[PDB]
Design a protein around this ligand. Structure first.
Ligand SMILES: Cc1cc2nc3c(=O)[nH]c(=O)nc-3n(C[C@H](O)[C@H](O)[C@H](O)COP(=O)(O)O)c2cc1C
Ligand SMILES: Cc1cc2nc3c(=O)[nH]c(=O)nc-3n(C[C@H](O)[C@H](O)[C@H](O)COP(=O)(O)O)c2cc1C
Lengths: 122, 122
């Protein structure tokens, strides 16, 4: 589900954005490119320190959107590219998916996104 | 209301994310940090090439969220910071606000976000 170009982006630093559906409109939070841990089976795991509004939103609608990119990775028509990722989210406080990011001692949980599509948008 | 630290982020490379309310959940698109033009009156202007889905969403609900950041600007507790911006959006296709993105020959419109709040989230 995730292409090589996406993994090239992860080698470079940047701001990842994660959108959820809130009660009165969207919500949007961030993690660093370098924090994403990709597992077998199309899973992206990120360390959760805060994300309290985000978790409440996911509890009611598991569908999330994620974007990320880098000026340092070539797109289709010039330098720089990025991705829109769609997937279903779940929060874990134990298990192997949590342990994948437990090295971040500030992490109260892991946000696990199982990817349903990845589009290179540049 | 945009703080100095926000303008420092704009001096650095990054991916900006813009969330809108869609009919069946959020939508999320990107521009580059360096593309943003800030005008007086709390206005952030970005070049529109695609964003047809985003524009349709704005037509139904003008409220948007924006995040951006940089590892190269110090946050409150270490290197790296970023912002959550909330504001109202409009799409201009003539006039001063459109002229503000004139350097982008590929642009079909200017997305003008009038900022209601800016929160440094790291
Ligand atoms: C560049 C950047 C990186 C961030 N990385 C994380 C992160 O790895 N984990 C986290 O929980 N919050 C991170 N945050 C903070 C979140 O964006 C968000 O503000 C916070 O978790 C509160 O989430 P909520 O609004 O859903 O309650 C980061 C913020 C920025 C600007
Ligand atoms: C790093 C990056 C920068 C982008 N910059 C722009 C931009 O300046 N203007 C634009 O219209 N689309 C830009 N895009 C594409 C948008 O994110 C989006 O995919 C496209 O405009 C279609 O919008 P829509 O899904 O709302 O129709 C960029 C994408 C990436 C990954």
């Amino acid at each position: 589900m995730l292409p090589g170009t996406f993994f090239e982006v992860l080698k470079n630093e940047g701001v990842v954005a994660i959108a959820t559906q809130g009660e009165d409109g969207p919500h949007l939070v961030n993690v660093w490119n370098s924090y994403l841990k990709v597992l077998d089976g199309n899973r992206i795991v990120v360390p959760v320190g805060g994300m309290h509004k985000t978790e409440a939103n996911v509890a009611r609608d598991e569908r999330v959107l994620m974007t990320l990119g880098s000026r340092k990775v070539a797109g289709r028509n010039g330098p720089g590219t990025g991705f829109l990722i769609r997937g279903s989210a779940a929060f874990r406080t134990d298990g192997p998916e949590f342990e994948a990011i437990a090295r971040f001692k500030w992490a109260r949980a892991a946000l696990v996104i199982t990817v349903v599509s990845a589009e290179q948008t540049l």
